[PDB]
Design a protein around this ligand. Structure first.
Ligand SMILES: CN[C@@H]1[C@H](O)[C@H](NC)[C@H]2O[C@@]3(O)C(=O)C[C@@H](C)O[C@H]3O[C@@H]2[C@H]1O
Length: 157
RNA sequence: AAAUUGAAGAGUUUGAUCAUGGCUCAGAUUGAACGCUGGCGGCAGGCCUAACACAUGCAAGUCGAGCGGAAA
């Protein structure tokens, strides 16, 4: 499987005695639409090579997230650098109500119904890190019951 | 039974960066106005300004089973 999205391309510069070496950063996200998601950030002097590098990096850095059949089990907060993300489970039909970067991550991860907001910096590179920080923080009701030595019933009763 | 199902961001400071932080934009709205354009219908709405000044007509009469009457 592995759906791969390109969140951002950006032209960066190193100043040099000559003039300016201009290069390209690519922020990509990969996942299986069913719990795995990874990001990759690649650099190169050509755009295709950056995307390629990012994709390769992404594949290696993928991570399980506990989803509730296309939504979250509970609300989560993420933070990275100055980017803060809130995401909340939603009813089916809602769609991914996330903003930029955050929606790419949620697409490939397999979230179809979520409510989001991104506070603070909306810098793609940081949002993506916050989003996957948050998706990492999610636990299934079973996991939460396992940890508290109770049953899914008793947790919710 | 139901009385809800709800939350998007982008541009712009730098050679580049990340932050901070303004500014700006996408939405919805309206007793609107203006420009261009303009077929019909239904239902609403229509001096937000000068509590400015107002021509003209009209917007509070009715009762003869209260009364003397009798203009017609
Ligand atoms: C004195 N010779 C210089 C010296 O080799 C410089 N490197 C320290 C060399 O640097 C270059 O190669 C550069 O990259 C910068 C450019 C302006 O000059 C080029 O030619 C520069 C040469 O002219």
């Amino acid at each position: 499987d592995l759906q791969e999205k390109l969140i951002a391309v950006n032209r960066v510069s190193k100043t040099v005695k000559g003039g300016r070496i201009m290069s390209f950063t690519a922020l990509t996200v990969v996942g299986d639409g069913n719990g795995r998601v990874g990001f990759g950030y690649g650099k190169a002097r050509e755009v295709p090579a950056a995307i390629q590098k990012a994709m390769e990096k992404a594949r290696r850095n993928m991570t399980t997230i506990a989803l509730n059949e296309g939504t979250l089990h509970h609300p989560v907060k993420g933070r990275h650098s100055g980017s803060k993300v809130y995401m909340q489970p939603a009813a089916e039909g809602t769609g991914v109500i996330a903003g930029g970067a955050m929606r790419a991550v949620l697409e490939v991860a397999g979230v179809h119904n979520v409510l989001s907001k991104a506070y603070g910096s909306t810098n793609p590179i940081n949002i993506v890190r916050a989003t996957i920080d948050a998706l990492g923080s999610m636990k299934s009701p079973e996991m939460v019951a396992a940890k508290r030595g109770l049953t899914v019933e008793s947790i919710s009763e």
